[PDB]
């Protein structure tokens, strides 16, 4: 037969590739190497829109003139002083190890293993909650409802990510959706497989209907995983 769109995505062509050359740099923490226990200080110069971040970034000038990017917290001003390190105070925009952040605090941009740089709760409008502290692990509620354990030396930032409420206003036009999907080149517009031919999809045929259950095993090979993949249930409730 012929290939699927998700099979063609794996080969890595311009039709499926991200235009990262349009984006501001990557957002990472300073390494622990330079922050053994130094507790640097910085000042915010400017706040900027990023086309590949779903959140605004802020530029910060540090001890030695170095300029870094950060995910901007809600409420941050130009001309603020932000601190990174163990003896930093508890204030919106400051980065601390999870072992110095009390229970009940809102946190974002958390590391999985220390030194990583930031992996979880980065998206516009998100926040996480510290639930419990211990000597072996700290426990955090994530925006999916999942409770996860981190090493207490993993770093995190205090506050909430800026840019929330994007989805309260509707997209009204195919043209606006065109521009939105062209910013980050997502595959748009989207076809339906039940309206393709048989060579093209497990669905497909002159009579436009799925002729067998949409639920598909976890152990099915590529070319077949379409529909509801390993679904525990279906329907509304």
11-70: contacts with RNA (CB under 7 A): 11-14, 16-18, 20-27, 49, 51-55, 65
Residue from the set 30, 93, 156, 201 that interacts with RNA by CB under 7 A:
201
Residue from the set 89, 102, 104, 222 that interacts with RNA by CB under 7 A:
222
Q: Got the DSSP string for 78-145?
A: TT-EEEESTT--S-TT-EEEGGGS-TT-EEESB-SSTTS---BS-STT--EEEEE--SS-EEEE-TTS
Burial 100-118 (b: 16+ CB within 10 A, else e): ebeeebbbbbbbeebeeeb
- Tell me: does residue 1 bind RNA (CB under 7 A): no
Write the interaction track for RNA spanning residues 114-153; mark x where CB under 7 A is met and - where it is not: -----xxxxxxxx---------------xxx-x-x-----
- Tell me: does residue 102 bind RNA (CB under 7 A): no
Residue 100 C-beta: closest distance to RNA, Å: 22
C-beta of 36 vs 236, nearer to RNA: 236
Residue from the set 102, 190, 199, 206 that interacts with RNA by CB under 7 A:
190
- Tell me: does residue 112 bind RNA (CB under 7 A): yes
3-state secondary structure labels for all residues of 143-174: CCCCEEEECCCCEEEECCECCCCHHHCCCCCH
Largest CA distance in the chain: 69
- Tell me: does residue 90 bind RNA (CB under 7 A): no
Strand-pairing partners, residue 130, are 140
- Tell me: does residue 104 bind RNA (CB under 7 A): no
Residue 116 C-beta: closest distance to RNA, Å: 7
In this structure, the number of other CB atoms found within 10 A of the CB of residue 158 comes to 20
How many residues interact with RNA (rule CB under 7 A)? 100
């Amino acid at each position: 037969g012929k290939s699927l769109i998700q099979q063609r995505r794996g080969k890595g062509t311009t039709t499926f590739r991200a235009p990262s050359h349009r984006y501001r740099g990557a957002v990472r923490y300073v390494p622990l190497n330079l922050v053994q226990e130094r507790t640097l200080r910085g000042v915010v110069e400017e706040i900027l829109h990023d086309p590949g971040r779903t959140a605004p970034v802020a530029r910060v000038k540090f001890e030695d003139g170095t300029k870094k990017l950060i995910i901007a917290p809600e409420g941050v001003l130009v001309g603020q002083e932000i601190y990174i390190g163990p003896e930093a105070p508890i204030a919106i925009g400051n980065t601390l190890p999870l072992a110095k952040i009390p229970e009940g605090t809102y946190v974002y941009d958390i590391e999985g293993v220390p030194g990583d740089g930031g992996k979880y709760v980065r998206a516009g409008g998100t926040y996480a909650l510290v639930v419990s502290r211990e000597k072996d692990k700290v426990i955090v509620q994530l925006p999916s409802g999942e409770l996860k354990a981190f090493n207490p030396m993993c770093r995190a930032t205090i506050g909430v990510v800026a840019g929330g409420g994007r989805l309260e206003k509707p997209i009204v036009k195919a043209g606006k959706a065109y521009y939105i999907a062209k910013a980050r080149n997502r595959f748009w517009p989207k076809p339906r497989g039940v309206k393709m031919n048989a060579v093209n999809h497990p669905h497909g045929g002159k009579e436009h209907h799925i002729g067998r259950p949409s639920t598909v095993s976890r152990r099915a090979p590529p070319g077949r995983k379409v529909g509801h993949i390993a679904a525990r249930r279906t329907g509304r409730r």
